Design an enzyme around this catalytic site. Structure first.
Site, short mmCIF file in Angstrom:
data_model
loop_
_atom_site.label_atom_id
_atom_site.label_comp_id
_atom_site.label_asym_id
_atom_site.label_seq_id
_atom_site.Cartn_x
_atom_site.Cartn_y
_atom_site.Cartn_z
N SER A 11 59.28 43.08 57.14
CA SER A 11 59.45 41.69 57.57
C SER A 11 60.84 41.36 58.05
O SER A 11 61.00 40.39 58.77
CB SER A 11 59.06 40.69 56.49
OG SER A 11 60.10 40.48 55.55
N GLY A 45 55.91 43.51 54.49
CA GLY A 45 55.47 44.19 53.30
C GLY A 45 55.40 45.68 53.39
O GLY A 45 55.08 46.32 52.38
N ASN A 74 61.10 47.47 50.75
CA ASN A 74 59.97 47.16 49.88
C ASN A 74 59.82 48.18 48.76
O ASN A 74 59.52 47.80 47.64
CB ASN A 74 58.70 46.98 50.69
CG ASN A 74 58.76 45.69 51.47
OD1 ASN A 74 59.01 44.65 50.88
ND2 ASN A 74 58.53 45.75 52.76
N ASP A 155 61.64 30.10 50.05
CA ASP A 155 61.67 31.08 48.96
C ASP A 155 63.08 31.63 48.67
O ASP A 155 63.34 32.31 47.66
CB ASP A 155 60.64 32.22 49.19
CG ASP A 155 60.74 32.91 50.58
OD1 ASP A 155 61.81 32.88 51.21
OD2 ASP A 155 59.69 33.46 51.03
N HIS A 158 63.26 35.23 52.52
CA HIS A 158 63.05 35.64 53.90
C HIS A 158 63.84 34.75 54.85
O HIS A 158 63.74 33.54 54.79
CB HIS A 158 61.59 35.53 54.26
CG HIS A 158 60.71 36.42 53.47
ND1 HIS A 158 59.90 36.00 52.44
CD2 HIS A 158 60.44 37.72 53.65
CE1 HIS A 158 59.23 37.02 51.96
NE2 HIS A 158 59.51 38.08 52.70
C1 OCA Z 1 66.22 43.44 49.88
C2 OCA Z 1 65.54 44.60 50.61
C3 OCA Z 1 64.93 44.13 51.95
C4 OCA Z 1 63.43 43.77 51.95
C5 OCA Z 1 62.68 43.33 53.22
C6 OCA Z 1 61.12 43.40 53.30
C7 OCA Z 1 60.33 42.11 52.94
C8 OCA Z 1 58.96 42.09 53.51
O1 OCA Z 1 58.83 43.08 54.19
O2 OCA Z 1 58.13 41.13 53.34
#
Ligand code: OCA
Length: 182
Positions: A11, A45, A74, A155, A158
């Site tokens: 994401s 995700g 993730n 949240d 993101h």
């Molecule tokens: C803190 C590590 C970065 C994570 C990003 C992925 C979140 C998602 O893909 O929904």
């Protein structure tokens, strides 16, 4: 020629709960105006393993010159063993090179409050792999974005749509030496 940059991400590259056209890789595509095409192949995700599973079809389809790999966060947010993420990313890098593409590996980190031995082990995989494969290690933007509430979704996890132009511009700067536009 107009080369293709494929983004193999989660994401952070897809954008969470937003249009593909709002996410920074699409904004980057627009900025580059057909000097270079950016193909976003990112899925919210996705683990590194999920990205790896998608990769061969994308390499066949898109025949990219470069593949920006933005994966593993993730895995780390789920506490899986760093060596498994490392090995999966290793295989991704191998596959990208074997398709005659240049990998670009984005450093990923967990947040400051994450378990600290673990976070250090997780984050260490990225410089290790970039050295191993002698590929660009691109910096990670998320912690800076998270400092701006106005760039984050409710949240606090993101980035939002307003963040994306900023990320695009920053990524354009990071990628300038790689695409070598006129
Ligand atoms: C803190 C590590 C970065 C994570 C990003 C992925 C979140 C998602 O893909 O929904």
């Amino acid at each position: 020629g107009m080369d293709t940059l494929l983004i193999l991400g989660d994401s952070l590259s897809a954008g969470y709960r937003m249009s593909a056209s709002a996410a920074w890789p699409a904004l980057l595509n627009d900025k580059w105006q057909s000097k270079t095409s950016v193909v976003n192949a990112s899925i919210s995700g996705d683990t590194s393993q999920q990205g790896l599973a998608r990769l061969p079809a994308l390499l066949k389809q898109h025949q990219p010159r470069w593949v920006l790999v933005e994966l593993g966060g993730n895995d780390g947010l789920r506490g899986f063993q760093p060596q498994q993420t490392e090995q999966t990313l290793r295989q991704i890098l191998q596959d990208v090179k074997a398709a005659n593409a240049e990998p670009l590996l984005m450093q990923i980190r967990l947040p400051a409050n994450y378990g600290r031995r673990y976070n250090e082990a997780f984050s260490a995989i990225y410089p290790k792999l970039a050295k191993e494969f002698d590929v660009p290690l691109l910096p990670f933007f998320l912690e800076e974005v998270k400092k701006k509430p106005q760039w984050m979704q409710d949240d606090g996890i993101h980035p939002n749509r307003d963040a994306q132009p900023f990320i695009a511009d920053w990524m354009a700067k990071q990628l300038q030496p790689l695409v070598n536009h006129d």
